[PDB]
């Protein structure tokens, strides 16, 4: 009986096996656009993703990971709020059973029919585990998805999908270029969280882009076509990945934009 997003281990009951939950700076959060601050000591944003090298995509049970080498300063993000070089480990998504929910992160109570989260550490913590383990130790960069257009940069990984259906598939996945993903603009929001799933750590500086990206429907219902469960396991589809907004408690978001 281990955490998922059901009635009976989803995100109401992980405090139990995770107090943290409970915690001081827990993501996601609702982003209130008129109680964000600009703040004009916030940098541009240096995404740096020409020489990124994915590997695999991998169905964890919960969503599934697009997995990059990180063993070398590759795919890297810096600037922004940060302090330091952020090396990105793995992408994955939220979203949900209707394209009227699915995001973590909502902007003025706003939910978005997914939500990409781009996974980085912090080069001076040495590796990823070492990193969950600080507070400035991640930087993950949320972008919003919404229902409209299709995206062509995400028809690769929506493709591979049927060869990755169940919990514990992995293919690979080559010479994917995650910057076919990002908007044009690079306006954010930032503050200090936690991973969004268990364990729930406290290491997360979050940097959400105002601008979503639209991907077509037929994208985002392929999403929907996931399982949670593994091979010959009674099926039940992946939708529905996200928590819900939490307190922000004593945080303030800043804002990249005026
Ligand atoms: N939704 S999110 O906040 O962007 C998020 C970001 C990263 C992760 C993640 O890769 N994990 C959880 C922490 C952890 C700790 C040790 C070893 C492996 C992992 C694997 C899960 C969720
Ligand atoms: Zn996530």
């Given at each position: 009986h281990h955490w998922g997003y059901g009635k009976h281990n989803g995100p109401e009951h992980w405090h139990k096996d995770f107090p943290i939950a409970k915690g001081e700076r827990q993501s996601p959060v609702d982003i209130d656009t008129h109680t964000a601050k600009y703040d004009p000591s916030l940098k541009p944003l240096s995404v740096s993703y020409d020489q990124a090298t994915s590997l695999r995509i991998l169905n964890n049970g919960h969503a599934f990971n697009v997995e990059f080498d990180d063993?070398?300063?590759?795919?890297?993000?810096?600037?922004?709020?940060?302090?330091?070089?952020?090396?990105?480990?793995?992408?994955?998504?939220?979203?949900?059973?209707?394209?009227?929910?699915?995001?973590?992160?909502?902007?003025?109570?706003?939910?978005?029919?997914?939500?990409?989260?781009?996974?980085?550490?912090?080069?001076?913590?040495?590796?990823?585990?070492?990193?969950?383990?600080?507070?400035?130790?991640?930087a993950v960069l949320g972008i919003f998805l919404k229902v409209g257009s299709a995206k062509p940069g995400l028809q690769k990984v929506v493709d591979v999908l049927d060869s990755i259906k169940?919990?514990?598939?992995?293919?690979?996945?080559?010479?994917?270029?995650?910057?076919?993903?990002?908007?044009?603009?690079?306006?954010?929001?930032?503050?200090?969280?936690?991973?969004?799933?268990?364990?729930?750590?406290?290491?997360?500086?979050?940097?959400?882009?105002?601008?979503?990206?639209?991907?077509?429907?037929?994208?985002?219902?392929?999403?929907?076509?996931?399982?949670?469960?593994?091979?010959?396991?009674?099926?039940?589809?992946?939708?529905?990945?996200?928590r819900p907004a939490q307190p922000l408690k004593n945080r303030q978001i800043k804002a990249s934009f005026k």
């Open positions: 063993s070398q300063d590759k795919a890297v993000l810096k600037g922004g709020p940060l302090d330091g070089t952020y090396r990105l480990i793995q992408f994955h998504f939220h979203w949900g059973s209707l394209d009227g929910q699915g995001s973590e992160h909502t902007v003025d109570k706003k939910k978005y029919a997914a939500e990409l989260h781009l996974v980085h550490w912090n080069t001076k913590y040495g590796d990823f585990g070492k990193a969950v383990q600080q507070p400035d130790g991640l169940t919990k514990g598939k992995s293919a690979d996945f080559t010479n994917f270029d995650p910057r076919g993903l990002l908007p044009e603009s690079l306006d954010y929001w930032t503050y200090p969280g936690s991973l969004t799933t268990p364990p729930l750590l406290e290491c997360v500086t979050w940097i959400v882009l105002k601008e979503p990206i639209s991907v077509s429907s037929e994208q985002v219902l392929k999403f929907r076509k996931l399982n949670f469960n593994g091979e010959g396991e009674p099926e039940e589809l992946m939708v529905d990945n996200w």
